[PDB]
Symmetry: C4
Subunit: 190 residues, 4 copies
Amino acid sequence: MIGRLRGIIIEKQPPLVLIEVGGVGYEVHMPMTCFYELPEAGQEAIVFTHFVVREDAQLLYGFNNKQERTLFKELIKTNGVGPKLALAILSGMSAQQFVNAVEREEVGALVKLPGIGKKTAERLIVEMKDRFKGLHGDLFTPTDDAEQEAVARLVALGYKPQEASRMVSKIARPDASSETLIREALRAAL
Amino acid sequence: MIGRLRGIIIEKQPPLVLIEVGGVGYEVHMPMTCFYELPEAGQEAIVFTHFVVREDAQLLYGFNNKQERTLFKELIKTNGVGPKLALAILSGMSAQQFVNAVEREEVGALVKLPGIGKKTAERLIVEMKDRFKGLHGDLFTPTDDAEQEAVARLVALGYKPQEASRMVSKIARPDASSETLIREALRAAL
Amino acid sequence: MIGRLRGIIIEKQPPLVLIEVGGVGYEVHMPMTCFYELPEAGQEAIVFTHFVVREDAQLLYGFNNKQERTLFKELIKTNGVGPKLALAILSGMSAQQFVNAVEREEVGALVKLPGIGKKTAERLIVEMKDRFKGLHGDLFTPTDDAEQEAVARLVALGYKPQEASRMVSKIARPDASSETLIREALRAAL
Amino acid sequence: MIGRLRGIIIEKQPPLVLIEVGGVGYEVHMPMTCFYELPEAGQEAIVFTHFVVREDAQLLYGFNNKQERTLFKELIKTNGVGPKLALAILSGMSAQQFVNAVEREEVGALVKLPGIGKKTAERLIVEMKDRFKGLHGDLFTPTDDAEQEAVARLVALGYKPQEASRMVSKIARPDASSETLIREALRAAL
């Protein structure tokens, strides 16, 4: 439900940060690489969050931008990676580096990580390297921003990636509103 | 627990909208047709919400008015429809149209939707067409507002629809307070 | 976690009330008898809440005072009564009346309620009539306020009611702070 | 998710305290020893919280400082102790005393507590006495603050305590930022 927090840094205890928001102190778990970018206690901070429901707990994982959160979200969707390990992966390396490692396929580096499997490492690379394709953004892009947006949305709707791809690509060009595109796409399909 | 949000639109990423409320950024999932009616980022918005608890997540589905939320709630109560599909149904068509399709019984249209079943489509129509009856409102009405209110309440209480119907219809007429009606109805039954 | 709400009544739809608290609109389910006492929409209201976690939902049940909430809490602890029925019981009758019915043991009245069992009604009376004993308050009292408080606390701690009873009654008298009593009681027992 | 609350004490009903935060009244369960230190109703209070998710409830346990919370957290991680008993242990004795009892290994005292097991008491002592070692703080310390911090973090990451211990101890000395230490440690290990 919670995607972002805006408040004052009350305490820092890596990798935990306590952010006061209107009297409510929220504990946020952040990968060290994000952690380094946090402002000083007493100052205002903005963090992108990912909520994790768990058996005996409700947790928030935070990032400095939406790109890093996406990467995190992506990592955890795999069978072998959970939030805790995802946090460790992004504490040893930055989103950027991680992305490079995968592209350059360097398991070596990945293994140097606790709980990090080899067959796991290998599988990871393979898997992630694949997921980045359908991923657009500075991070995941070493075409059209709105089209790519309209697509994601259409895919969020239930349309098979390729279907969607086709559905917007048929009608299109700029000075459209992904919103407009999405809109159009739908009419022309139902 | 959360039925409405009032705050500033921070970002739009259809079908997701991020609404800032006193420093807390809430992610809201909205059907495209509602989405189109949202104000611009930076401005204040009011959205009616439906909370969905899930295995690994807590989600909020939002609408522009209570009527659309009801329709959504209604759709999801069926065996074949879940929140994600309900969101897709209301992204392809507006509450109004949807309501028409059902009344005019046009499966054709419904099928043109991913995950949307035929036997499902058929069953849907049949089912919804039935549920709208007991549903009062501009949407679900192509009698007395308070009586109909007193009834719903009495039905919320545990009374069988027909019982309730009868219970208020026996004593009644205007310049009553559904609250008054409900009140009266009860005394006269216990 | 949430025991009280202070905010503006945005809408009333018995038995549901929507209360705006700093931009967050909370849905509260209230027994009709409490409902009648609510102020007008647009005005400030204070409601005592009971949180109910459920399979696919998180709900808040509200009351006008702590006594009515207690009674509700009490009712639901029984095997045969759940929140929905407890809300119906307190919609047909007021906490006061309910309390009388039980004391005067009048099943007749109770049965006049949907889902309300006879063996259930009977069992209820019996059960509640018993629970009120250990219950102190205007409602549940057709001795010492602090002692009774110190006891409850000591009982919250794990002490068997009678033990606790004894533990404070040995040392005591006024111008004590239940807090003081509790304190004392403990030292003298460990 | 909630680690701290800052608001006005609305009511005290040991061991429960109701804290108003921006219109939201939060119920907090506090060990009596913490309870005694609370300010008067009407005044502002700051409490450190521990969230407990439960079958039919969501609860918050509060403390006056982070040390007492840690101790609580520690206690509950054991097989034999749950939140309710942990609250009773800290209501009979203060964090300090408790810590002493364990160090001085005095079961006698512990047993004087409801639900408190003997084999349990014994096991406890043994267990806690062990956990305090890896615990640094005034409470749990009848070396370097940042190093010890860097370690905890590295351990939060997945590193075996000893590994971490070694990893920071190799490179180190002051006027470092646990953050710096952590940082360094990582590079030199991957």
